[PDB]
Design a protein around this nucleic acid. Sequence first.
RNA 1: AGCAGAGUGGCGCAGCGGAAGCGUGCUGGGCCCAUAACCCAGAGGUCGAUGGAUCGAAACCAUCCUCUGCUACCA
Lengths: 266, 422
Amino acid sequence: CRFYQHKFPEVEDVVMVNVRSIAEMGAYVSLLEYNNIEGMILLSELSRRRIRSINKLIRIGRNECVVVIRVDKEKGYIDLSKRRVSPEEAIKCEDKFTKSKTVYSILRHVAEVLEYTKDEQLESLFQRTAWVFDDKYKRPGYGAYDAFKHAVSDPSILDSLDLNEDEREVLINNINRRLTPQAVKIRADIEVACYGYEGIDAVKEALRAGLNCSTETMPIKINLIAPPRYVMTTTTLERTEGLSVLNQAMAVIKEKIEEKRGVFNV
Amino acid sequence: QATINIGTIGHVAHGKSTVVKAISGVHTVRFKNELERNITIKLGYANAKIYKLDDPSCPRPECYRSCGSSTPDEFPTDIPGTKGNFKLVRHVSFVDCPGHDILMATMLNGAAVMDAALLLIAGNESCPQPQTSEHLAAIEIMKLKHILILQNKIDLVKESQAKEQYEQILAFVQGTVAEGAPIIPISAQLKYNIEVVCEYIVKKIPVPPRDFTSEPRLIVIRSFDVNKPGCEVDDLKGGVAGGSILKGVLKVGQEIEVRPGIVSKDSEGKLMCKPIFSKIVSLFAEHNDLQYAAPGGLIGVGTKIDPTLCRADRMVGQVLGAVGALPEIFTELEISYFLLRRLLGVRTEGDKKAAKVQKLSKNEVLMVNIGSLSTGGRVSAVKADLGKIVLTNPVCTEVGEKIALSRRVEKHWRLIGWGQIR
RNA sequence: AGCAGAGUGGCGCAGCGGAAGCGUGCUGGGCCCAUAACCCAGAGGUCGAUGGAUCGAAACCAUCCUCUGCUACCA
């Protein structure tokens, strides 16, 4: 269904719909943030200015970041807006939906990992996994609480979503299989250009301690890519571990080269 | 190791690759590789093991025949002898001096540490050729006369056009020792007469009288860094200070300085400098390890200076004497000099611009090639035979052998004469 | 050499496991008496290779291939 505990969009709900088929006045477009729920567009008000064209190679299957004017919770008609849109840029909701496709797809087998998909007991599948985040206040809350889950190695088996199978055969591999987590590896450049004949040994000395501080606390691999330049590529999985790799590198470059009186750039 | 240093010196459009590999077999290479437009403008190194088969050729390590690869038109077949585990006569070293008119100064620095020269003449350009007037008279001042005039590009140039040039270049170096220099017509296409030329680089060029027991006077003209990009932390090394030693045998583990050195911190005037002392890590012999650096040869002297002190060729013209070296460090300099009546190093078919040069004026920068060093300085008080120049860097005269003074009459400084250190 | 980027339709070039993308060139019809301007339709996919972890990579993930660049040369 959807990973939203709420069924329907609300008033002025900026929603991401799916352009299935173009119809007479417009297109019966179906939401995907909320399950599959149909909405409508033009005749009335979607466009703002007049240039009189709609498509050149744009075939089918588009998604429209549109704002709910009218919603019929009983009858089933969701009137949508883009003429009102000065600030509701399409990039933010789709990239949220690019997450929220995977945020849903993580939380809809589940059904200890095969995965299947489809189907388990669909509503009870989400109260245990998908809507229990949406129950977990607030809505900016489970923007991070779900992100706490698919930051998988930071950590895996912590705070609840201890529901329901146990969950944990999914929570190890199927989170990594459904999300396929991406993509950050932070390069960390240290260019130490000493020009005399004294402080250039301190470049090598802070490289010597740069190995040692990468050996003691074990950050990864302070390298030499050039005689002035010490560049490491810090893989980051905890969203804060790359700074601890970098700041222990900068502490060596700042102080050990100052001991033998050289200059640096970092 | 090495006992001699022969300069492969020659003017524009004669080819350097087919002739230096014919006499050595080891190619002179540096950056921009992307190699070279016409002839090698860098001060490159070349080292080889010349020998004989009771036959005055320099044979290849496959010493049955010498079938070179300088052309595919005719198969160059000389007979250097036969196999049979050849007898090693000596070890030959080369100093590849630059041969363009723009790089006359770095030519003078690398040739000031060598022991011998070759004059590599193209038959292409004008028969009163300027660099043959330039180089030979410059060789005359740097206490060298070991010259082999080697007319290098006469393969398309006919025997009567080649006839005019070596006569007319010798007609202008008539005040220079080049008459004891044999004029050898060879082929840069058929690699021809190298069995006769490598006789002459043994015959005309023997082992010079070289100070073995003296203090080590290395003068580096080429910097080399074994601390290349891609190195590591536990791969810590020094910087290779590779130049020709003109005096004194040098050993591995010797604490060597660069005696002209670097300006010290907060020099409000001109007179404060410190040599950079360094222990020598290794000594190179053409492919081979040694503990000795027998001078009169281009010797790779790997020292314990820092990676930045060799990451570029920053030691061009530096007296690297040992720890506690005697020769002084001058940043202001009293020179005695003579001005040559021909502006030497530039002459065309209309004889431009070798006319008489206006005298040196004070507060004017002039390149001084002191010993083998590459520095520039302005003259403070200029007389007829009393020059008082102040240098931007404290430079060391290895000995008061010679200086080469040039005046900026064009885009590059051009040779107006020579002189000596008072 | 270590280093930094890309590889994707003919091109420009989207893209990140429930996807081979548009923008241009490209061909026919529509429209008109016709052109221009334009509409509809046709044609253009090794996502470099290898593929695997995989429910299924283009992606993820690596490797090598190509291009772009570097200390500027490293006895």
